[PDB]
PDB file of N, CA and C in Angstrom:
ATOM      1  N   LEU A   1     -60.108 -62.261   4.480  1.00  0.00           N
ATOM      2  CA  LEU A   1     -59.600 -63.615   4.122  1.00  0.00           C
ATOM      3  C   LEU A   1     -59.246 -64.404   5.372  1.00  0.00           C
ATOM      4  N   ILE A   2     -59.329 -65.730   5.257  1.00  0.00           N
ATOM      5  CA  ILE A   2     -59.089 -66.594   6.413  1.00  0.00           C
ATOM      6  C   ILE A   2     -57.661 -66.478   6.935  1.00  0.00           C
ATOM      7  N   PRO A   3     -56.611 -66.618   6.119  1.00  0.00           N
ATOM      8  CA  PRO A   3     -55.253 -66.530   6.679  1.00  0.00           C
ATOM      9  C   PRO A   3     -54.904 -65.162   7.237  1.00  0.00           C
ATOM     10  N   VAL A   4     -55.663 -64.122   6.898  1.00  0.00           N
ATOM     11  CA  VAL A   4     -55.487 -62.810   7.509  1.00  0.00           C
ATOM     12  C   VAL A   4     -56.191 -62.825   8.857  1.00  0.00           C
ATOM     13  N   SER A   5     -55.463 -63.200   9.905  1.00  0.00           N
ATOM     14  CA  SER A   5     -56.053 -63.329  11.228  1.00  0.00           C
ATOM     15  C   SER A   5     -54.956 -63.234  12.277  1.00  0.00           C
ATOM     16  N   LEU A   6     -55.248 -62.513  13.360  1.00  0.00           N
ATOM     17  CA  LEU A   6     -54.325 -62.441  14.484  1.00  0.00           C
ATOM     18  C   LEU A   6     -54.302 -63.730  15.289  1.00  0.00           C
ATOM     19  N   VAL A   7     -55.358 -64.538  15.199  1.00  0.00           N
ATOM     20  CA  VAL A   7     -55.363 -65.834  15.863  1.00  0.00           C
ATOM     21  C   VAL A   7     -54.314 -66.751  15.248  1.00  0.00           C
ATOM     22  N   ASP A   8     -54.094 -66.634  13.940  1.00  0.00           N
ATOM     23  CA  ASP A   8     -53.111 -67.441  13.234  1.00  0.00           C
ATOM     24  C   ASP A   8     -51.707 -66.858  13.307  1.00  0.00           C
ATOM     25  N   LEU A   9     -51.508 -65.773  14.057  1.00  0.00           N
ATOM     26  CA  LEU A   9     -50.192 -65.157  14.155  1.00  0.00           C
ATOM     27  C   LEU A   9     -49.331 -65.840  15.210  1.00  0.00           C
ATOM     28  N   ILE A  10     -49.938 -66.237  16.328  1.00  0.00           N
ATOM     29  CA  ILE A  10     -49.242 -66.892  17.432  1.00  0.00           C
ATOM     30  C   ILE A  10     -49.929 -68.233  17.674  1.00  0.00           C
ATOM     31  N   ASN A  11     -50.357 -68.883  16.594  1.00  0.00           N
ATOM     32  CA  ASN A  11     -51.068 -70.150  16.701  1.00  0.00           C
ATOM     33  C   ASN A  11     -50.218 -71.192  17.417  1.00  0.00           C
ATOM     34  N   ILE A  12     -50.719 -71.664  18.561  1.00  0.00           N
ATOM     35  CA  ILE A  12     -50.024 -72.676  19.346  1.00  0.00           C
ATOM     36  C   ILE A  12     -49.926 -74.001  18.605  1.00  0.00           C
ATOM     37  N   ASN A  13     -50.832 -74.266  17.666  1.00  0.00           N
ATOM     38  CA  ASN A  13     -50.774 -75.515  16.917  1.00  0.00           C
ATOM     39  C   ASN A  13     -49.541 -75.553  16.021  1.00  0.00           C
ATOM     40  N   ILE A  14     -49.254 -74.448  15.333  1.00  0.00           N
ATOM     41  CA  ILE A  14     -48.047 -74.373  14.520  1.00  0.00           C
ATOM     42  C   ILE A  14     -46.808 -74.389  15.399  1.00  0.00           C
ATOM     43  N   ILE A  15     -46.912 -73.877  16.620  1.00  0.00           N
ATOM     44  CA  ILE A  15     -45.777 -73.939  17.528  1.00  0.00           C
ATOM     45  C   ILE A  15     -45.514 -75.380  17.942  1.00  0.00           C
ATOM     46  N   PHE A  16     -46.572 -76.160  18.170  1.00  0.00           N
ATOM     47  CA  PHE A  16     -46.396 -77.587  18.416  1.00  0.00           C
ATOM     48  C   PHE A  16     -45.783 -78.276  17.206  1.00  0.00           C
ATOM     49  N   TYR A  17     -46.210 -77.881  16.007  1.00  0.00           N
ATOM     50  CA  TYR A  17     -45.614 -78.400  14.780  1.00  0.00           C
ATOM     51  C   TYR A  17     -44.111 -78.166  14.764  1.00  0.00           C
ATOM     52  N   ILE A  18     -43.701 -76.925  15.015  1.00  0.00           N
ATOM     53  CA  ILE A  18     -42.287 -76.566  15.007  1.00  0.00           C
ATOM     54  C   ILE A  18     -41.536 -77.327  16.093  1.00  0.00           C
ATOM     55  N   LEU A  19     -42.133 -77.425  17.281  1.00  0.00           N
ATOM     56  CA  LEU A  19     -41.510 -78.129  18.395  1.00  0.00           C
ATOM     57  C   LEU A  19     -41.233 -79.581  18.046  1.00  0.00           C
ATOM     58  N   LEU A  20     -42.267 -80.304  17.614  1.00  0.00           N
ATOM     59  CA  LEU A  20     -42.094 -81.712  17.286  1.00  0.00           C
ATOM     60  C   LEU A  20     -41.116 -81.883  16.134  1.00  0.00           C
ATOM     61  N   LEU A  21     -41.188 -80.992  15.145  1.00  0.00           N
ATOM     62  CA  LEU A  21     -40.303 -81.069  13.992  1.00  0.00           C
ATOM     63  C   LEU A  21     -38.844 -80.987  14.411  1.00  0.00           C
ATOM     64  N   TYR A  22     -38.495 -79.982  15.208  1.00  0.00           N
ATOM     65  CA  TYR A  22     -37.090 -79.782  15.525  1.00  0.00           C
ATOM     66  C   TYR A  22     -36.599 -80.694  16.637  1.00  0.00           C
ATOM     67  N   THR A  23     -37.481 -81.178  17.515  1.00  0.00           N
ATOM     68  CA  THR A  23     -37.085 -82.267  18.401  1.00  0.00           C
ATOM     69  C   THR A  23     -36.736 -83.513  17.602  1.00  0.00           C
ATOM     70  N   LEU A  24     -37.520 -83.819  16.568  1.00  0.00           N
ATOM     71  CA  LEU A  24     -37.206 -84.975  15.740  1.00  0.00           C
ATOM     72  C   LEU A  24     -35.930 -84.750  14.945  1.00  0.00           C
ATOM     73  N   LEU A  25     -35.728 -83.521  14.477  1.00  0.00           N
ATOM     74  CA  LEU A  25     -34.465 -83.160  13.850  1.00  0.00           C
ATOM     75  C   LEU A  25     -33.306 -83.488  14.771  1.00  0.00           C
ATOM     76  N   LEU A  26     -33.356 -82.976  16.002  1.00  0.00           N
ATOM     77  CA  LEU A  26     -32.321 -83.241  16.994  1.00  0.00           C
ATOM     78  C   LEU A  26     -32.137 -84.733  17.225  1.00  0.00           C
ATOM     79  N   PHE A  27     -33.234 -85.485  17.239  1.00  0.00           N
ATOM     80  CA  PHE A  27     -33.130 -86.921  17.446  1.00  0.00           C
ATOM     81  C   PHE A  27     -32.384 -87.588  16.299  1.00  0.00           C
ATOM     82  N   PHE A  28     -32.551 -87.074  15.080  1.00  0.00           N
ATOM     83  CA  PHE A  28     -32.003 -87.705  13.886  1.00  0.00           C
ATOM     84  C   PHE A  28     -30.719 -87.063  13.363  1.00  0.00           C
ATOM     85  N   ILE A  29     -30.165 -86.049  14.044  1.00  0.00           N
ATOM     86  CA  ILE A  29     -28.872 -85.487  13.621  1.00  0.00           C
ATOM     87  C   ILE A  29     -27.801 -86.561  13.455  1.00  0.00           C
ATOM     88  N   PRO A  30     -27.555 -87.446  14.427  1.00  0.00           N
ATOM     89  CA  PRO A  30     -26.481 -88.438  14.253  1.00  0.00           C
ATOM     90  C   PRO A  30     -26.666 -89.383  13.075  1.00  0.00           C
ATOM     91  N   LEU A  31     -27.837 -89.419  12.444  1.00  0.00           N
ATOM     92  CA  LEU A  31     -28.020 -90.159  11.204  1.00  0.00           C
ATOM     93  C   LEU A  31     -27.804 -89.289   9.976  1.00  0.00           C
ATOM     94  N   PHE A  32     -28.003 -87.975  10.095  1.00  0.00           N
ATOM     95  CA  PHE A  32     -27.686 -87.076   8.993  1.00  0.00           C
ATOM     96  C   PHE A  32     -26.183 -86.915   8.822  1.00  0.00           C
ATOM     97  N   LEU A  33     -25.424 -87.051   9.903  1.00  0.00           N
ATOM     98  CA  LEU A  33     -23.973 -86.959   9.854  1.00  0.00           C
ATOM     99  C   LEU A  33     -23.305 -88.226   9.346  1.00  0.00           C
ATOM    100  N   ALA A  34     -24.069 -89.253   8.994  1.00  0.00           N
ATOM    101  CA  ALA A  34     -23.527 -90.575   8.701  1.00  0.00           C
ATOM    102  C   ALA A  34     -23.266 -90.776   7.220  1.00  0.00           C
ATOM    103  N   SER A  35     -22.808 -89.733   6.541  1.00  0.00           N
ATOM    104  CA  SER A  35     -22.381 -89.809   5.153  1.00  0.00           C
ATOM    105  C   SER A  35     -20.862 -89.866   5.098  1.00  0.00           C
ATOM    106  N   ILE A  36     -20.344 -90.719   4.221  1.00  0.00           N
ATOM    107  CA  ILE A  36     -18.917 -91.000   4.135  1.00  0.00           C
ATOM    108  C   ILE A  36     -18.312 -90.182   3.005  1.00  0.00           C
ATOM    109  N   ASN A  37     -17.208 -89.505   3.301  1.00  0.00           N
ATOM    110  CA  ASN A  37     -16.355 -88.885   2.301  1.00  0.00           C
ATOM    111  C   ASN A  37     -15.125 -89.754   2.088  1.00  0.00           C
ATOM    112  N   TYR A  38     -14.598 -89.714   0.867  1.00  0.00           N
ATOM    113  CA  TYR A  38     -13.476 -90.552   0.454  1.00  0.00           C
ATOM    114  C   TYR A  38     -12.175 -89.767   0.379  1.00  0.00           C
ATOM    115  N   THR A  39     -11.961 -88.846   1.315  1.00  0.00           N
ATOM    116  CA  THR A  39     -10.766 -88.010   1.320  1.00  0.00           C
ATOM    117  C   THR A  39      -9.605 -88.665   2.058  1.00  0.00           C
ATOM    118  N   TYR A  40      -9.883 -89.378   3.144  1.00  0.00           N
ATOM    119  CA  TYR A  40      -8.827 -90.064   3.868  1.00  0.00           C
ATOM    120  C   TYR A  40      -8.375 -91.324   3.155  1.00  0.00           C
ATOM    121  N   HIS A  41      -9.237 -91.915   2.331  1.00  0.00           N
ATOM    122  CA  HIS A  41      -8.787 -92.945   1.403  1.00  0.00           C
ATOM    123  C   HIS A  41      -7.725 -92.386   0.469  1.00  0.00           C
ATOM    124  N   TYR A  42      -7.988 -91.202  -0.084  1.00  0.00           N
ATOM    125  CA  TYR A  42      -7.021 -90.540  -0.947  1.00  0.00           C
ATOM    126  C   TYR A  42      -5.731 -90.249  -0.201  1.00  0.00           C
ATOM    127  N   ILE A  43      -5.836 -89.780   1.041  1.00  0.00           N
ATOM    128  CA  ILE A  43      -4.635 -89.443   1.796  1.00  0.00           C
ATOM    129  C   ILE A  43      -3.819 -90.696   2.090  1.00  0.00           C
ATOM    130  N   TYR A  44      -4.483 -91.796   2.443  1.00  0.00           N
ATOM    131  CA  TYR A  44      -3.769 -93.039   2.703  1.00  0.00           C
ATOM    132  C   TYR A  44      -3.091 -93.553   1.447  1.00  0.00           C
ATOM    133  N   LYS A  45      -3.775 -93.469   0.310  1.00  0.00           N
ATOM    134  CA  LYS A  45      -3.243 -94.059  -0.908  1.00  0.00           C
ATOM    135  C   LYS A  45      -2.108 -93.224  -1.486  1.00  0.00           C
ATOM    136  N   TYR A  46      -2.206 -91.898  -1.389  1.00  0.00           N
ATOM    137  CA  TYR A  46      -1.316 -91.006  -2.118  1.00  0.00           C
ATOM    138  C   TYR A  46      -0.194 -90.420  -1.275  1.00  0.00           C
ATOM    139  N   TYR A  47      -0.349 -90.347   0.043  1.00  0.00           N
ATOM    140  CA  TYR A  47       0.731 -89.859   0.892  1.00  0.00           C
ATOM    141  C   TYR A  47       1.849 -90.890   0.910  1.00  0.00           C
ATOM    142  N   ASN A  48       2.990 -90.530   0.327  1.00  0.00           N
ATOM    143  CA  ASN A  48       4.146 -91.416   0.210  1.00  0.00           C
ATOM    144  C   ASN A  48       5.359 -90.682   0.770  1.00  0.00           C
ATOM    145  N   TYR A  49       5.731 -91.027   1.997  1.00  0.00           N
ATOM    146  CA  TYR A  49       6.971 -90.539   2.580  1.00  0.00           C
ATOM    147  C   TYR A  49       8.158 -90.920   1.704  1.00  0.00           C
ATOM    148  N   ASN A  50       9.218 -90.123   1.792  1.00  0.00           N
ATOM    149  CA  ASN A  50      10.420 -90.393   1.017  1.00  0.00           C
ATOM    150  C   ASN A  50      11.056 -91.687   1.497  1.00  0.00           C
ATOM    151  N   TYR A  51      11.102 -92.671   0.610  1.00  0.00           N
ATOM    152  CA  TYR A  51      11.621 -93.994   0.917  1.00  0.00           C
ATOM    153  C   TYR A  51      13.071 -94.176   0.499  1.00  0.00           C
ATOM    154  N   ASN A  52      13.703 -93.152  -0.062  1.00  0.00           N
ATOM    155  CA  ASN A  52      15.101 -93.261  -0.433  1.00  0.00           C
ATOM    156  C   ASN A  52      15.975 -93.249   0.812  1.00  0.00           C
ATOM    157  N   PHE A  53      17.087 -93.966   0.735  1.00  0.00           N
ATOM    158  CA  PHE A  53      18.032 -94.086   1.832  1.00  0.00           C
ATOM    159  C   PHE A  53      19.224 -93.167   1.613  1.00  0.00           C
ATOM    160  N   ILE A  54      19.946 -92.920   2.692  1.00  0.00           N
ATOM    161  CA  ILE A  54      21.157 -92.112   2.659  1.00  0.00           C
ATOM    162  C   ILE A  54      22.340 -93.019   2.364  1.00  0.00           C
ATOM    163  N   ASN A  55      23.225 -92.556   1.485  1.00  0.00           N
ATOM    164  CA  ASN A  55      24.421 -93.305   1.101  1.00  0.00           C
ATOM    165  C   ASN A  55      25.544 -92.294   0.896  1.00  0.00           C
ATOM    166  N   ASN A  56      26.438 -92.195   1.882  1.00  0.00           N
ATOM    167  CA  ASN A  56      27.534 -91.238   1.794  1.00  0.00           C
ATOM    168  C   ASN A  56      28.512 -91.602   0.686  1.00  0.00           C
ATOM    169  N   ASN A  57      28.714 -92.891   0.441  1.00  0.00           N
ATOM    170  CA  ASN A  57      29.641 -93.337  -0.591  1.00  0.00           C
ATOM    171  C   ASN A  57      29.024 -93.172  -1.976  1.00  0.00           C
TER     172      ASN A  57
ATOM    173  N   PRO B 331      46.923-105.051  -2.445  1.00  0.00           N
ATOM    174  CA  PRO B 331      45.750-105.651  -1.799  1.00  0.00           C
ATOM    175  C   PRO B 331      44.545-105.725  -2.734  1.00  0.00           C
ATOM    176  N   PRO B 332      43.447-106.347  -2.288  1.00  0.00           N
ATOM    177  CA  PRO B 332      42.252-106.391  -3.147  1.00  0.00           C
ATOM    178  C   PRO B 332      41.680-105.016  -3.437  1.00  0.00           C
ATOM    179  N   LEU B 333      41.714-104.116  -2.459  1.00  0.00           N
ATOM    180  CA  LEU B 333      41.138-102.791  -2.602  1.00  0.00           C
ATOM    181  C   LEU B 333      42.147-101.821  -3.205  1.00  0.00           C
ATOM    182  N   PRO B 334      41.686-100.709  -3.779  1.00  0.00           N
ATOM    183  CA  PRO B 334      42.605 -99.640  -4.205  1.00  0.00           C
ATOM    184  C   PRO B 334      42.802 -98.514  -3.198  1.00  0.00           C
ATOM    185  N   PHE B 335      42.108 -98.536  -2.059  1.00  0.00           N
ATOM    186  CA  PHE B 335      42.138 -97.433  -1.108  1.00  0.00           C
ATOM    187  C   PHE B 335      42.174 -97.991   0.309  1.00  0.00           C
ATOM    188  N   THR B 336      42.264 -97.076   1.279  1.00  0.00           N
ATOM    189  CA  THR B 336      42.329 -97.400   2.696  1.00  0.00           C
ATOM    190  C   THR B 336      40.976 -97.092   3.334  1.00  0.00           C
ATOM    191  N   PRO B 337      40.095 -98.074   3.542  1.00  0.00           N
ATOM    192  CA  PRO B 337      38.799 -97.760   4.154  1.00  0.00           C
ATOM    193  C   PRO B 337      38.939 -97.381   5.619  1.00  0.00           C
ATOM    194  N   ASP B 338      38.131 -96.410   6.039  1.00  0.00           N
ATOM    195  CA  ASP B 338      38.061 -95.993   7.438  1.00  0.00           C
ATOM    196  C   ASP B 338      37.003 -96.850   8.120  1.00  0.00           C
ATOM    197  N   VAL B 339      37.455 -97.872   8.850  1.00  0.00           N
ATOM    198  CA  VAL B 339      36.555 -98.889   9.388  1.00  0.00           C
ATOM    199  C   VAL B 339      35.536 -98.285  10.344  1.00  0.00           C
ATOM    200  N   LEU B 340      35.888 -97.196  11.023  1.00  0.00           N
ATOM    201  CA  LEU B 340      34.950 -96.581  11.954  1.00  0.00           C
ATOM    202  C   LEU B 340      33.788 -95.937  11.212  1.00  0.00           C
ATOM    203  N   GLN B 341      34.084 -95.196  10.144  1.00  0.00           N
ATOM    204  CA  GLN B 341      33.029 -94.523   9.401  1.00  0.00           C
ATOM    205  C   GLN B 341      32.154 -95.511   8.643  1.00  0.00           C
ATOM    206  N   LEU B 342      32.696 -96.673   8.283  1.00  0.00           N
ATOM    207  CA  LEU B 342      31.896 -97.681   7.597  1.00  0.00           C
ATOM    208  C   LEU B 342      30.989 -98.421   8.569  1.00  0.00           C
ATOM    209  N   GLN B 343      31.502 -98.761   9.752  1.00  0.00           N
ATOM    210  CA  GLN B 343      30.651 -99.342  10.782  1.00  0.00           C
ATOM    211  C   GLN B 343      29.609 -98.342  11.256  1.00  0.00           C
ATOM    212  N   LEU B 344      29.930 -97.051  11.194  1.00  0.00           N
ATOM    213  CA  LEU B 344      28.953 -96.019  11.517  1.00  0.00           C
ATOM    214  C   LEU B 344      27.810 -96.023  10.513  1.00  0.00           C
ATOM    215  N   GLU B 345      28.138 -95.931   9.224  1.00  0.00           N
ATOM    216  CA  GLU B 345      27.109 -95.952   8.191  1.00  0.00           C
ATOM    217  C   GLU B 345      26.364 -97.277   8.186  1.00  0.00           C
ATOM    218  N   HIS B 346      27.064 -98.373   8.473  1.00  0.00           N
ATOM    219  CA  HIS B 346      26.415 -99.677   8.487  1.00  0.00           C
ATOM    220  C   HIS B 346      25.414 -99.783   9.628  1.00  0.00           C
ATOM    221  N   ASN B 347      25.788 -99.313  10.817  1.00  0.00           N
ATOM    222  CA  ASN B 347      24.894 -99.427  11.964  1.00  0.00           C
ATOM    223  C   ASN B 347      23.703 -98.491  11.825  1.00  0.00           C
ATOM    224  N   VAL B 348      23.921 -97.308  11.258  1.00  0.00           N
ATOM    225  CA  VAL B 348      22.825 -96.377  11.029  1.00  0.00           C
ATOM    226  C   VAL B 348      21.900 -96.913   9.946  1.00  0.00           C
ATOM    227  N   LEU B 349      22.481 -97.410   8.855  1.00  0.00           N
ATOM    228  CA  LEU B 349      21.679 -97.884   7.736  1.00  0.00           C
ATOM    229  C   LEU B 349      20.924 -99.155   8.085  1.00  0.00           C
ATOM    230  N   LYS B 350      21.478 -99.984   8.968  1.00  0.00           N
ATOM    231  CA  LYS B 350      20.797-101.214   9.354  1.00  0.00           C
ATOM    232  C   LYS B 350      19.475-100.912  10.044  1.00  0.00           C
ATOM    233  N   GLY B 351      19.492 -99.989  11.003  1.00  0.00           N
ATOM    234  CA  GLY B 351      18.264 -99.634  11.693  1.00  0.00           C
ATOM    235  C   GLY B 351      17.251 -98.975  10.779  1.00  0.00           C
ATOM    236  N   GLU B 352      17.728 -98.189   9.815  1.00  0.00           N
ATOM    237  CA  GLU B 352      16.822 -97.572   8.855  1.00  0.00           C
ATOM    238  C   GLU B 352      16.136 -98.612   7.985  1.00  0.00           C
ATOM    239  N   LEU B 353      16.804 -99.733   7.714  1.00  0.00           N
ATOM    240  CA  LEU B 353      16.197-100.794   6.924  1.00  0.00           C
ATOM    241  C   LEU B 353      15.196-101.592   7.746  1.00  0.00           C
ATOM    242  N   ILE B 354      15.556-101.934   8.982  1.00  0.00           N
ATOM    243  CA  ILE B 354      14.633-102.653   9.852  1.00  0.00           C
ATOM    244  C   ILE B 354      13.414-101.794  10.146  1.00  0.00           C
ATOM    245  N   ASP B 355      13.633-100.511  10.426  1.00  0.00           N
ATOM    246  CA  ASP B 355      12.522 -99.609  10.692  1.00  0.00           C
ATOM    247  C   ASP B 355      11.662 -99.404   9.455  1.00  0.00           C
ATOM    248  N   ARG B 356      12.244 -99.556   8.266  1.00  0.00           N
ATOM    249  CA  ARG B 356      11.458 -99.484   7.043  1.00  0.00           C
ATOM    250  C   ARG B 356      10.604-100.731   6.871  1.00  0.00           C
ATOM    251  N   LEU B 357      11.177-101.907   7.127  1.00  0.00           N
ATOM    252  CA  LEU B 357      10.422-103.147   6.997  1.00  0.00           C
ATOM    253  C   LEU B 357       9.250-103.184   7.965  1.00  0.00           C
ATOM    254  N   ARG B 358       9.433-102.637   9.166  1.00  0.00           N
ATOM    255  CA  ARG B 358       8.340-102.601  10.127  1.00  0.00           C
ATOM    256  C   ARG B 358       7.207-101.720   9.628  1.00  0.00           C
ATOM    257  N   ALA B 359       7.543-100.630   8.942  1.00  0.00           N
ATOM    258  CA  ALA B 359       6.518 -99.779   8.361  1.00  0.00           C
ATOM    259  C   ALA B 359       5.821-100.462   7.197  1.00  0.00           C
ATOM    260  N   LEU B 360       6.541-101.296   6.449  1.00  0.00           N
ATOM    261  CA  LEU B 360       5.933-102.002   5.332  1.00  0.00           C
ATOM    262  C   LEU B 360       5.042-103.135   5.815  1.00  0.00           C
ATOM    263  N   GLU B 361       5.505-103.889   6.810  1.00  0.00           N
ATOM    264  CA  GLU B 361       4.655-104.879   7.456  1.00  0.00           C
ATOM    265  C   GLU B 361       3.411-104.231   8.044  1.00  0.00           C
ATOM    266  N   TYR B 362       3.550-103.007   8.550  1.00  0.00           N
ATOM    267  CA  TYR B 362       2.406-102.268   9.062  1.00  0.00           C
ATOM    268  C   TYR B 362       1.424-101.919   7.954  1.00  0.00           C
ATOM    269  N   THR B 363       1.925-101.636   6.753  1.00  0.00           N
ATOM    270  CA  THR B 363       1.060-101.290   5.635  1.00  0.00           C
ATOM    271  C   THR B 363       0.493-102.525   4.954  1.00  0.00           C
ATOM    272  N   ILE B 364       1.246-103.626   4.956  1.00  0.00           N
ATOM    273  CA  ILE B 364       0.764-104.873   4.377  1.00  0.00           C
ATOM    274  C   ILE B 364      -0.456-105.376   5.128  1.00  0.00           C
ATOM    275  N   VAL B 365      -0.536-105.091   6.427  1.00  0.00           N
ATOM    276  CA  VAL B 365      -1.686-105.505   7.223  1.00  0.00           C
ATOM    277  C   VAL B 365      -2.966-104.909   6.660  1.00  0.00           C
ATOM    278  N   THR B 366      -2.890-103.679   6.163  1.00  0.00           N
ATOM    279  CA  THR B 366      -4.052-103.032   5.580  1.00  0.00           C
ATOM    280  C   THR B 366      -4.335-103.513   4.166  1.00  0.00           C
ATOM    281  N   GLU B 367      -3.356-104.131   3.505  1.00  0.00           N
ATOM    282  CA  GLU B 367      -3.584-104.693   2.181  1.00  0.00           C
ATOM    283  C   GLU B 367      -4.152-106.102   2.268  1.00  0.00           C
ATOM    284  N   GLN B 368      -3.678-106.900   3.225  1.00  0.00           N
ATOM    285  CA  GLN B 368      -4.236-108.225   3.444  1.00  0.00           C
ATOM    286  C   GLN B 368      -5.552-108.186   4.204  1.00  0.00           C
ATOM    287  N   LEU B 369      -5.962-107.017   4.692  1.00  0.00           N
ATOM    288  CA  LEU B 369      -7.322-106.805   5.166  1.00  0.00           C
ATOM    289  C   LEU B 369      -8.251-106.424   4.025  1.00  0.00           C
ATOM    290  N   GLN B 370      -7.802-105.519   3.159  1.00  0.00           N
ATOM    291  CA  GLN B 370      -8.596-105.129   2.006  1.00  0.00           C
ATOM    292  C   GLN B 370      -8.737-106.269   1.010  1.00  0.00           C
ATOM    293  N   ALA B 371      -7.772-107.185   0.984  1.00  0.00           N
ATOM    294  CA  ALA B 371      -7.845-108.329   0.088  1.00  0.00           C
ATOM    295  C   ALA B 371      -8.774-109.407   0.617  1.00  0.00           C
TER     296      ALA B 371
END
């Protein structure tokens, strides 16, 4: 069979494929990280320090 | 007299001076938070 071949085991063409693929991955990481979570919105809205005052009398 | 007791003027000026700063420091925190509400608005 064709895919049963030692030439296709260390094929430099697929290595170029992998190289270009992961270089492009590296180039686009800062866009994959650009998703917003709404957890600090929750922290801002719900974190309420104690607003009661001290009154000895 | 108008009062029924003898107030300790030192302890009242103490609580007054402490409580005054706590109120001003509270208003500054609220003005700080209002800035984020008049931005969101």
